Design a binder for these strands. Sequence first.
RNA 1: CCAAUGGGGCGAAGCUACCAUCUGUGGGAUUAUGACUGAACGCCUCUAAGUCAGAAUCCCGCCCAGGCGGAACGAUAGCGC
Length: 190
Amino acid sequence: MKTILSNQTVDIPENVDISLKGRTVIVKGPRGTLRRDFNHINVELSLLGKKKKRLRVDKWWGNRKELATVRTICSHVQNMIKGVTLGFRYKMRSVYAHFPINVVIQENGSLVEIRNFLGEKYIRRVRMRPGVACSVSQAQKDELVLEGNDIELVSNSAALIQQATTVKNKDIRKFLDGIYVSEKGTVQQA
RNA sequence: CCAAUGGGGCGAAGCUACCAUCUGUGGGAUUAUGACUGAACGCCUCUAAGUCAGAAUCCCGCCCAGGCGGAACGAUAGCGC
Ligand SMILES: [Mg+2]
Ligand SMILES: [Mg+2]
Ligand SMILES: [Mg+2]
Ligand SMILES: [Mg+2]
Ligand SMILES: [Mg+2]
Ligand SMILES: [Mg+2]
């Protein structure tokens, strides 16, 4: 049936000062600014309270499919606040059996050269979205580190190289090779 | 010269043979599929809203023809403003 009211609040930390024009939200703070346009979701955004301490999202007279769309806005706003405060440092491992996967990074995090995967002479030049920085960390042999603010762009850049390092026309249950996401965390801790 | 091209050789030009030689292209949205974020369902989840990769398929290009479709320009005789 049409549920008369569904709502969920987001308590924002004092380091962040959010605002909104219409239904598009912006989140700024220490690391940078992140925007998201909500023109597909059709809800009410109340930015109430002095010092803008909480964001409320209403849905009036919507059945189950639009009631499912209420918590996802809360989740995207909380992910954006987490990206602005802390960030998204996706650590990921290069698993191989025989051939060492040669990974190097061109243009300070914009492109990844992937070489020597199952003895293939073809190289993969996988380009990240601007905003995501790829790097090789210290004290670890096979490691790729993806830094960024937008969880969409960082995890999409992870999925690009994870689907680039795939084994074709073989048994992937035996050939356990490729670069795979290992740790999903933040840049700085809290 | 005649023998309805008399016959037999070689043979210009022209046509001709994968029987000689030359050439045959680039993108877009996407199917299947694999995924990202994320609820419904405190968790999970490729999907519900949103997003990515994606192909002899589809469409466009390149190419062939040019609309009872247009075009700018030139010259306009007893002829136009
Ligand atoms: Mg086989
Ligand atoms: Mg002859
Ligand atoms: Mg001859
Ligand atoms: Mg395409
Ligand atoms: Mg799908
Ligand atoms: Mg796509």
